[PDB]
Ribonuclease pancreatic
Amino acid sequence: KETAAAKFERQHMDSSTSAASSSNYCNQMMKSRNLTKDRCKPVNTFVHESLADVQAVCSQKNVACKNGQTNCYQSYSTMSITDCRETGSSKYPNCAYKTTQANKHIIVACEGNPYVPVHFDASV
Ligand SMILES: [Rh+2]
Ligand SMILES: [Rh+2]
């Protein structure tokens, strides 16, 4: 089916835009990436960097993951990102999000061979 690596790309990668297309960005992107299908995914981050640059983080600063696993990695350089956060008045199926652009270090969890991002842990 959909690999963990492909799922990370669907849920977290948006290399096409340098920053959050618009105030509508999260409303459109959360739906189109199928993060609103079964429920409103409450929070989700999209990264506006090349796939190779995000895959390279698996080789960068090793940090503890929030769940206590050891396989998380923080980017040495800041990256362009968009945080999506479901609004207090959002009601499934009409999932509503606030769109916020940032330039932060990302923290991803990496797994497999090849060793690639499979979850988005945090930005700092
Ligand atoms: Rh820094
Ligand atoms: Rh700094």
About this structure: The longest strand covers residues 79-86. Strands lie at 43-47, 61-63, 72-74, 79-86, 97-104, 106-111, 116-123. Residues 105 surround rhodium(II) ion (ligand 1) (CB under 6 Å). The radius of gyration is 14 Å.
